């Protein structure tokens with residue numbers, strides 16, 4: 272009936288911000304080669320204040336060279352003694368975010384780790400000091416090379432924590448003058464971190480924030496008891512259609528109302544990875560075509576705005592927040608300077624389903640809601656109104672100011688289903704706009720890369736999405752014809768998060784491709800035992816990369832070749848002998864059309880008219896038999912979709 276908003280009785284919890292995750296894994300892969308001005312426009316829609324999603328927080332993966340959901344991300348230490356703070360794109364992304372918003376909050380979290388940290392086991396807790404040293408080097412590098420202050424560091428994404436590790440990490444941060452960096456744990460479930468904090472005073476002293484994943488809007492009694500800030504440190508992960516925006520809208524309010532969570536962070540920031548990879552199109556917006564420049568400013572962007580443009584980290588929730596009588600919810604926040612923001616959501620069940628968890632049905636229906644401002648809020652006489660309707664839709668439209676001149680400090684709204692209203696004293700709101708970008712276009716049906724770039728802007732060639740292993744630009748001064756190549760640089764399996772393949776692989780192109788010719792120069796670095804391949808019709812990647820099928824043309828340094836149906840090499844289409852050895856350059860060609868494939872070695876037919884499964888479709892790919900050095904040059908693909 273009448274909902275009282277008031278601060279006379281005091282405040283609720285401090286609001287810590289809304290944000291998103293870039294990483295876990297390679298979710299921002301295709302954004303780096305967007306041409307201008309589009310790359311810059313996309314970044315403005317995400318980070319520019321008073322414009323688009325206007326995010327308060329950016330969480331990034333600390334790449335560990337393993338597969339982490341939609342690809343691998345490169346580490347700053349591939350090997351013992353190796354340090355390089357210029358790989359991948361997270362450094363770049365953080366800098367672009369800070370340029371737009373100097374106050375944005377930065378977080379880092381490992382999903383996987385380089386294998387050498389395990390000292391012969393696939394476990395990062397064998398040598399606590401060693402793993403801590405690795406993580407802290409990342410934070411130092413961020414500051415020293417990019418002028419980035421990392422605000423929060425996590426433990427091990429969705430994997431067990433070790434209490435002694437957390438203590439050693441704190442001691443190691445302090446020893447290196449990073450007393451200011453805070454620790455969030457354990458990026459998994461509420462337990463066992465929450466009970467652990469209550470039983471161990473020394474642990475409690477070193478953990479600043481309990482971050483839970485996909486909590487379904489709820490927390491647990493032990494977490495409330497700890498008195499720690501509680502964050503949904505990973506949530507969302509739904510296709511960014513109107514339904515995903517509904518999900519986002521609902522949890523943004525209800526994480527606080529139901530779960531005392533004062534921050535929510537969406538996986539992921541922007542869908543810049545091939546859509547046929549796991550959880551495709553699950554970013555706040557979509558930017559998956561750097562070749563065309565086409566991007567889509569999706570609904571979730573504006574749902575974010577309804578909160579982020581009108582609140583900042585450090586505002587407070589009022590004690591008076593709740594559910595509306597006929598379904599939906601409201602929160603309200605102040606900054607202790609006389610501003611007030613109120614956010615109302617009426618998302619219907621059927622249009623707000625998240626993947627984790629699925630909620631039993633609940634009812635929403637038309638209702639009137641009356642709000643009365645008591646206490647220090649009584650003196651407000653004017654509120655700006657912003658409105659979104661989801662599903663033919665209207666996004667972030669500024670309505671007529673509402674006036675509370677009558678002296679009643681009260682007002683009423685007609686609420687229907689699937690709406691959001693933001694009512695705020697702030698006058699800074701803006702529906703940012705750039706002109707439409709170029710239309711959508713398939714990946715180019717003819718495509719070439721000779722990797723001849725002397726000072727590349729990024730450490731890897733555009734469009735190649737590593738799914739196991741790490742491929743990088745490589746300069747070899749001691750050769751002329753292959754001075755500039757692409758090289759696979761892992762020499763041992765990472766401490767994996769996902770089930771990485773046993774073979775390294777990078778995919779590229781159009782998952783729809785069905786008939787195609789792939790050609791590449793290849794170079795095996797390991798005598799006797801080394802091997803490389805080129806492939807087409809590769810149908811799965813990311814978390815599922817082990818499952819990839821397609822047509823794989825392998826050559827080995829012992830003078831053999833195989834053609835397989837799967838990355839695992841369990842199904843043979845053909846095999847035989849070849850004039851192939853280590854440390855020599857060969858040109859491989861692979862032609863697939865309908866039921867039949869053929870392979871060429873240096874332009875000469877090696878096998879032809881081999882029967883392959885059809886129909887079938889997928890990416891082109893290159894890679895290596897195991898985690899071993901190998902080089903690639905002059906890649907070409909001609910394909911029909």
Ligand SMILES: *[C@@H]1O[C@H](CO)[C@@H](O[C@@H]2O[C@H](CO)[C@@H](O)[C@H](O)[C@H]2NC(C)=O)[C@H](O)[C@H]1NC(C)=O
Nearest residue numbers: 283284494495496498527528529530531532593
């Ligand atoms: C966490 O939030 C809950 C509500 O989600 C608060 O628990 C009580 O909630 C009921 C019903 O909504 C209110 O009537 C009470 O006023 C709340 N209890 C208290 C402590 O006043 C609870 O306050 C929050 N817990 C915290 C902040 O630790």
Ligand SMILES: *[C@@H]1O[C@H](CO)[C@@H](O[C@@H]2O[C@H](CO)[C@@H](O)[C@H](O)[C@H]2NC(C)=O)[C@H](O)[C@H]1NC(C)=O
Nearest residue numbers: 583606607608609610611651695696697698699
């Ligand atoms: C509402 O919020 C605005 C923005 O923070 C406040 O205006 C700022 O107030 C601070 C200190 O109070 C000043 O130093 C800044 O110059 C102001 N900035 C802007 C954007 O004007 C304002 O005081 C708050 N109160 C209301 C109701 O406007």
Ligand SMILES: *[C@@H]1O[C@H](CO)[C@@H](O[C@@H]2O[C@H](CO)[C@@H](O)[C@H](O)[C@H]2NC(C)=O)[C@H](O)[C@H]1NC(C)=O
Nearest residue numbers: 784785786787863864865866867885910911912
């Ligand atoms: C890929 O190649 C196959 C085989 O050539 C194509 O399928 C043939 O298409 C022709 C003309 O449309 C038909 O008359 C044949 O009967 C088809 N062969 C088989 C075995 O299906 C297929 O259409 C090509 N796909 C694309 C998109 O280029």
Ligand SMILES: *[C@@H]1O[C@H](CO)[C@@H](O)[C@H](O)[C@H]1NC(C)=O
Nearest residue numbers: 597598632633634635636637
């Ligand atoms: C939802 O609630 C409204 C209002 O009470 C009611 O008329 C409608 O039938 C309900 N729908 C379901 C399926 O519960």
Ligand SMILES: [Ca+2]
Nearest residue numbers: 721722723755
């Ligand atoms: Ca080259």
